[PDB]
Amino acid sequence: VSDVPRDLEVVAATPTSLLISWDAPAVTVHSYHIQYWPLGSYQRYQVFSVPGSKSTATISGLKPGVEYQIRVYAETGGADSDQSMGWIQIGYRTE
Amino acid sequence: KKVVLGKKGDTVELTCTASQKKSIQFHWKNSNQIKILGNQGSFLTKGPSKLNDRADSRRSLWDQGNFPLIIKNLKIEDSDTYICEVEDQKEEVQLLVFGLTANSGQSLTLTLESPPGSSPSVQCRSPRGKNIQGGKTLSVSQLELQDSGTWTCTVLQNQKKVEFKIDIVVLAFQKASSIVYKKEGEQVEFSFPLAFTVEKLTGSGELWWQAERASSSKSWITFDLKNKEVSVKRVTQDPKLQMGKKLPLHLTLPQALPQYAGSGNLTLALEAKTGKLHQEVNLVVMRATQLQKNLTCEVWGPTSPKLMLSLKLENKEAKVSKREKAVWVLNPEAGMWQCLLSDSGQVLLESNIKVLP
Amino acid sequence: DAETTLFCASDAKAYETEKHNVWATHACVPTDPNPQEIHLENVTEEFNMWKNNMVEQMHTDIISLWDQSLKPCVKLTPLCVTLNCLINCNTSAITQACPKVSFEPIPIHYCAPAGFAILKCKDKKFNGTGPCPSVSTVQCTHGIKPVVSTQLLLNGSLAEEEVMIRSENITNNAKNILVQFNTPVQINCTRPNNNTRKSIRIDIRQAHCNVSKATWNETLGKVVKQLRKHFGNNTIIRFANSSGGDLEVTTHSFNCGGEFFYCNTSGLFNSTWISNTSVQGDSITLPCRIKQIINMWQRIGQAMYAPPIQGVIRCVSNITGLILTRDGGSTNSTTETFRPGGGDMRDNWRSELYKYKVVK
C-alpha cells in the first residue's frame, strides 16, 4: 500500500504567498516536508517541515508572475523498512 | 460555440459581448441554470454558486461592452458549459480544465487529472528530446542521469492543446546509471544531486577511474564535504578537474579525449549514518575527421556491443556500417557526411563532418 | 413610441431653505390645476415596463439633484486611462464645502411635451409587461416622490385592491421582484438627544426604528399568499436576511436631513414561513446607525459627509413597496428563499412609473 501524498492543489495565492492543501496517505505520517523551487533551477530550492497532523501549508516570500514547482514529501516513522519516503509534485505561478 | 481550455490553478476568462457597449443588464448562468453572479450598476453582487468566492468578473470592463467571466485558481471541477445572458441571444462557451501531477530511484509516475467525458492524448518530451506518448497516466520506468532536466508535456484534446512544464531530477546514488556521450574536444560535466536529507549529514568521498589499459585500476580525486561546502583533498595531474564549491556536486572535464574514457566508480561515505554509497559512471568519446584521403570515425570507452556505428550523408545511404568500435572510409566521396553511433531506436552520438575535395 | 424629454411639474414654495424647494423652483413648473384624463375606448396597448425609456430620464434628473443638494467633503471617484491590457486607473478626488442642509422629498409630476401624449393603464392588477384594456390618456403623471432607499420602498402610492408582485421574469433568480402593498405600513425612526457620547475609547452614531408587528404581519401574510400561488408545489416560502455585499445593500438605507440611516433588518426577515406564522405569540426595535463614509448610488466611488446633527432626528415614514430577490438552483429542495435586494435605483422608480408610457 503506497505512502505518498495525494490530491495536492493550490488553495489560494497572492503575488508573494501560496497556500496549498494535500491529502494524507494510508499510513501514519511523522511529518510533511515542503520543498519548492522555481522552474528549471533545482539548486535554488527551499524546504521546510510541518508536523504529520496538519493538512495545509503556507509558503511566503514569493516573486510576482513567477513559475514555481512544489513538492510535498511524507515520512512515516512507524515502518522503518516496510514503507518509504514518497512525494507528490505540481507546478503553479504567482501573479 | 467556442471552446476554452485551461491549466489547473491558472486564471482564464470567457469573454462575452453584445451590441451596446455601455452599462446594460446581463448575467451568467451555468449548465445547472444557477446564477453565477449579478450586477446592480457598477458594483458586483455575488452569485449563489460555490464558485462565487473563487470566480469573479471585471467591473472595469463594462465600458467596452465586454462581459468577461474570470475564474481564478482553476480546479478540475469547473469544467462545464457556461451561458452569457443578454435577452437577445445567449453565447455558450464550453470549458474543459486539465491538470498535471507527478506521483511516486530509476522510475517515476505521472498522473494527468482530467474532467469527465474527455478523450485526451498526452505527449511529453525530455530535455534531451526523448519523446514519450501516453494517455491519462504516463510511467517513466527507465531513467538515466542525463534525462534529469525539464520535461515538457503537451496535452491535446480533439484539436485544442495546452502545454505544461514539469521538472525531473534523478537521484545520483540510487540504482540509476550515469553515461555521457561526447565528441573529442567538448567539455564533459558530471552532476550527482543527492537527496535533500543527506545534505546536512557531512562526509568524505572519492572517485576511481579505469581506462582501456589495465594499468589505471584506480585514479582520480578525493574530497571532503561539511555543511554545504565541497573541498577537494587530492586531484589528479592528468585531468584538470574542476569541482564546484557549492553544494550540488558539480564536476567538470575541460574537454573530452580518448584517454579520458572507461567505466568509473564514485564512492561517498559519511560519518553520520555510516552507509557505503556507490555510483557508476561512464564516458564515451567519438572522434570523426578526415586526414588526407582517409576519412575516419572511431569511438572509445565502454560501449555495449549491440550498438552500431555508421558513416553516412543523410542525403545518400550509409557508405559503411559495422558493429565494431572503429569505422573508416577509403578514398571518400565529396559531401556533408555524418558519423552516427546509434541504438536500434535512437542515435547516441551524431557528428557532422564536411569533406572539401 | 417616443424618446423625448419630459418637463417636471411640482408644487414648490420658492421661499424656504429646503433643498427640493430650491431645485423645484429653478427647474420645474407649477402643477396643472385642472387635469384632464380622457378615457379611451376598447383599446389594448402592450405596456412593457422593463424597457421603458421614461425611467431612464428620471434617474438622470435625480442625479442632477444630488449634485446640488449634498455636496460631499471628499468625492473619491475612479477614472481610468485608455490603455490596453496594467491599465492606468487613478482616483480623482474633489474637495468641496459641506454645509448641513435640510432634506425632504417633494412629489413631482412628469408631464409630456408639446406634441406627445402619455398613456396610462387602469387595471387593478396590470401584471407588469402585459397588455391591459382600460387604457386612458393623460398629460402628467401622479405624485412621485424621489425617495432614494434600498430593501423597502418608502413614501409613495399604494396598490388599488390587492398586493401584486411584479418581476421581469420569474424562475431565473436574477431579476428583482417588486412587491407593491395595498396598505400603508408605517415606520418611525428617531434619536432624540440622550447619546452625546462621541467615542468609546481612544452613542451619537446610534438610532432606532419601530414597526407595528400587529399590523405588519397582515401585509406579510398576504405576500406569502401571492408567492405561494407561483410555487404551490411541495416548496416552502422561507425568508432570510441578506447574503452579504456592500453595507448599502445588506441593510436598509434611507436619508433624513443628511443622516444616512443604515438600519439592520435581520429581525424582520428571519422568519421561515408556511400557511402559519413563526414570528411570536408591537415595537420591533430596528437598530440603526448613522454612517459617514458611504458608497454613492449615482455611480461607483465612495464619499464622505459631514458629522451628524446634535439631536432630534425624526422620520415619520410609510412603507408602500418591498424589493425581494430569489435564490433558486438545483440544490433548492422544495424551498423558496426571498432575500432582500434592491440597490439599483432604476428599479426603485420602475415601481412608480409602471402605469405610464410616452407615445406620439
Nearest to B112, CA basis, from B93, B127, B96 = B96
CA of B72, closest CA in chain C: separation in Å? 17
Q: Is residue B338 part of a domain?
A: yes
Residues in B touching C328 (Cβ below 8 Å): 33-35
Residue among C295, C300, C330 minimizing CB distance to B34: C330
Q: Which residues of B touch C240 (CB under 8 A)?
A: none
B57 lies in some domain: yes
Q: What gap in Å lies between CA C323 and CA C179, rounded to an integer?
A: 6
Between CA C164 and CA B250 the distance in angstroms is 82
Q: How many domains does chain B have?
A: 4
Residue B173 covered by a domain: no
**Residue C213 per-residue DSSP state:** H
Q: What is d(CA B154, CA A69) in angstroms, rounded to the nearest whole number?
A: 17
Helix, strand, or coil (residue C311): coil
Tell me how close the Cα of A69 comes to any Cα of chain B, in angstroms. Answer: 8
CA distances (Å), origin B9, targets B4, B317, B339: 15, 50, 47
Integer CA distances (angstroms), C57 to B12, C2, C82, C199, in order: 38, 13, 28, 43
Nearest chain B CA: its distance from C214 CA (Å)? 34
Is residue A78 assigned to a domain? yes
- What CATH number is associated with residue A82? 2.60.40.10
CB within 8 Å of C13: residues ≥ 6 apart: C21, C25
Interatomic CA distance for residues C357 and C118, integer angstroms: 6
Q: How many CA atoms lie within 13 A of B16 on its CB side?
A: 21
Element (H, E) at C255: strand C252-256
The total domain count for chain A is 1
Phi, psi at B214, each rounded to 5°: -70, -10
CA dist A55 and A20 (Å) reads 9
CB contact (8 A) between residue A4 and residue B103: yes
Q: Count how many Cα atoms sit within 13 Å of the Cα of residue A31 in the half-sphere of its side chain.
A: 8
| Nearest-5° Cα angle at A67, A64 to A73 | 115
Q: Does B150 touch chain A (CB under 8 A)?
A: yes
In a domain, B172, yes or no: no
B75 touches B8 (CB < 8 A): yes
Contact pairs from chain A to chain B, CB under 8 Å = 55
Instruction: Report the alpha-carbon distance of residue B268 to residue B274 in Å, rounded.
Output: 10
Whether B43 is covered by a domain: the verdict is yes
The answer as to whether B47 is a domain residue is yes
Q: What's the resolution in A?
A: 8.7
B248: contact with A, CB 8 A cutoff: yes
* Domain edge (last residue) among B46, B73, B97: B97
CA B269 to chain CA centroid, Å, is 30
Beta strands (DSSP E) in B184-294 are 188-191, 203-209, 222-226, 229-234, 242-243, 250-253, 264-269, 277-290
In a domain, A1, yes or no: no
Domain's final residue, options B284, B311, B337: B284
Same domain, B273 and B296: no
- Strand C336-338, strand C237-239: pairing: parallel
Q: Which of C309, C353, C330, C360 is nearest to C54 (CA)?
A: C353
Residue B63 belongs to a domain with what CATH number?
2.60.40.10
Q: What φ, ψ does residue C341 adopt, rounded to 5°?
A: -120, -130
Tell me the longest C-alpha to C-alpha distance in chain B: 89
Say yes or no: B10 and B80 in one domain. yes
Q: Which residues does chain B break after (C to N > 2.5 Å)? A: 104
Q: What is the DSSP string of C260-293?
A: EEEE--HHHH--B-SSS--S---B--EEE-B-SE
Is residue C228 within 8 A of residue C114, CB to CB? The reply is: no
C126: left (phi over 0), alpha (psi -120 to 50) or beta: left
Interface with B, mutate which of C148, C344, C347 (most B CBs under 10 A): C344
Q: Measure the CA–CA gap between A32 and A47, rounded to whole angstroms.
A: 10
User: Are B137 and B207 members of one domain?
Assistant: no
Longest CA span, chain A: 42
Q: To the nearest whole angstrom, how far is the Cα of C317 from the nearest Cα of chain B?
A: 26
**C306 DSSP 8-state letter:** P
Q: How far apart are the first and last CA of chain C?
A: 6
Beta strands in B86-170 (DSSP E): 90-103, 108-113, 121-125, 131-134, 137-140, 150-156, 161-167
Chain B interface includes C235 (CB < 8 A): no
- Please provide the size of chain C in residues: 360
* B75 lies in some domain: yes
d(CA B307, CA A87): 36
Residues spanned by the domain of A27: 6-94
Residues 6+ apart with CB under 8 A from C281: none
Residue type, B291: L
Which technique was the structure solved with, according to the deposited record? cryo-EM
Residue A50: inside a domain, yes or no?
yes
CB atoms within 10 A of CB C286: 22
Give the SS3 label for residue C23: helix
SS3 for B298? strand
* Residue-range definition of the domain harbouring residue B291: 286-355
Residue whose C-alpha cell reads 542525463 in the numeric block: B146
In this structure, are B143 and B186 located in the same domain? no
Q: Name which of C311, C307, C339 is nearest C323 in CA terms.
A: C339
Report DSSP state, residue B17.
B
User: Among B95, B119, B270, B259, which residue's Cα sits nearest to residue B195?
Assistant: B270
What grid cell was written down for C160?
A: 388599488
Tell me the CA distances in angstroms from B268 to A93, B189, B201, one per residue in order. 37, 18, 12
